[PDB]
Each structure stands twice: as structure tokens, then as C-alpha cells.
């Protein structure tokens, strides 16, 4: 038989504009998406954001970092002060769904 | 920008019968299979095997263990001996192309 074991990862360059990444996030440690599932997910992209633009992230897309920030067993707070204190340019680390 | 920075992994779990698991392998350190790459891949998929059969092993596939057997960066000797070593039961991990 076969079964993913870990996901494709892609790296997401995004330029910040004043109308910021523009998306959601859910999950995390006290604030789990899933039971027993602590991942950050990304949950709307919002029209006319720096995400929606690029066009590359997506709904249900896991996210495992924002720029030097690991964000793969953290709180749901922690995840988003690393979103908020992002400067202009921000890489982020996602794991696609394996199906 | 989006771009794959690691690959999908699977983990294919085979039974070797007498005709073994049936594929062929090329790479590995001091026979690189492209320029500056180390890896070792997939090359052929023999009709009647254990890989054949299972049909989720792909001719192109990189082949990164056998077993506990890491297969990132080894002689092609030590590949094929990794793949000889094997019992009735085998685990692969194998990255899968991120196109
Ligand atoms: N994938
Ligand atoms: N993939």
C-alpha cells in the first residue's frame, strides 16, 4: 500500500501592501481546529490582500511558518502575533493537503 | 511567488515475492544521475513485481529509504545493497515530483 507520511511544503514570497496579507488563520494549541490537531490552517483569503493576488495560498492550506517563526506546536496567539509583526516582505511555509 | 521548497512523502509498503520487488535504481554519489545531484531515482518498474503490482511506486520517483535505511546522500553501491538486504517485508520512502 501507500500513504503520505509528510506533505509537500512550499515557501510563499508575498510583498505586504497597505492592505495587508489578508487572510485567516484557525487552530493551535488552546484552539484546536481538529480534535488532537494543534496545525495552524488557513481559513478565508480575503479579496484584493497580498495572499489573494499572488493567488498561491489557499483555504485549508496548513501553515508551518512566517518568516524565522516556527508555528508547527504553538498557541493560537503566538501564531497570530508572528502574522502581525511581519515588515514588507514575508515568506511563509505551508504544507499542502496530500490528496 | 510560490515554489516547492520539500516534496511530498510517501511511504509504500511492499511483500516481496520470488520475483522481487522489481524496479531498478540509478544515482547516488559517484553516479549521479544529473549534474550536482545525489539522489537516487527510480529508473524502471519490471511487469510482474512487488512494485508493479502495488502500482504506486513510479519510474522517476526519488527513492529516500529502504527499511531504516537512509538513501539521501550514498554511494550507488550502497543503494543497491540496501535494496538487496531485504526481508519478506519492505517499507520505501519515497519523494514524489512537486508539479
Ligand atoms: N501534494
Ligand atoms: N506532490
Given at each position: 500500500?501507500?500513504?503520505?507520511?509528510?506533505?509537500?511544503?512550499?515557501?510563499?514570497?508575498?510583498?505586504?501592501?497597505?492592505?495587508?496579507?489578508?487572510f485567516?488563520?484557525?487552530?493551535?494549541?488552546?484552539?484546536?481546529?481538529?480534535?488532537?490537531?494543534?496545525?495552524?490552517?488557513?481559513?478565508?483569503?480575503?479579496?484584493?490582500?497580498?495572499?489573494?493576488?499572488?493567488?498561491?495560498?489557499?483555504?485549508?492550506?496548513?501553515?508551518?511558518?512566517?518568516?524565522?517563526?516556527?508555528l508547527?506546536?504553538?498557541?493560537?496567539?503566538?501564531?497570530?502575533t508572528?502574522?502581525?509583526?511581519?515588515?514588507?516582505?514575508?515568506?511563509?511555509?505551508?504544507?499542502?493537503?496530500?490528496?
Amino acid at each position: 500500500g501507500s500513504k503520505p507520511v509528510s506533505e509537500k511544503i512550499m515557501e510563499i514570497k508575498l510583498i505586504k501592501g497597505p492592505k495587508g496579507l489578508g487572510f485567516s488563520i484557525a487552530g493551535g494549541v488552546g484552539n484546536q481546529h481538529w480534535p488532537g490537531d494543534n496545525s495552524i490552517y488557513v481559513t478565508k483569503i480575503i479579496e484584493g490582500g497580498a495572499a489573494h493576488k499572488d493567488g498561491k495560498l489557499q483555504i485549508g492550506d496548513k501553515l508551518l511558518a512566517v518568516n524565522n517563526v516556527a508555528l508547527e506546536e504553538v498557541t493560537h496567539e503566538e501564531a497570530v502575533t508572528a502574522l502581525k509583526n511581519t515588515s514588507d516582505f514575508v515568506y511563509l511555509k505551508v504544507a499542502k493537503p496530500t490528496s
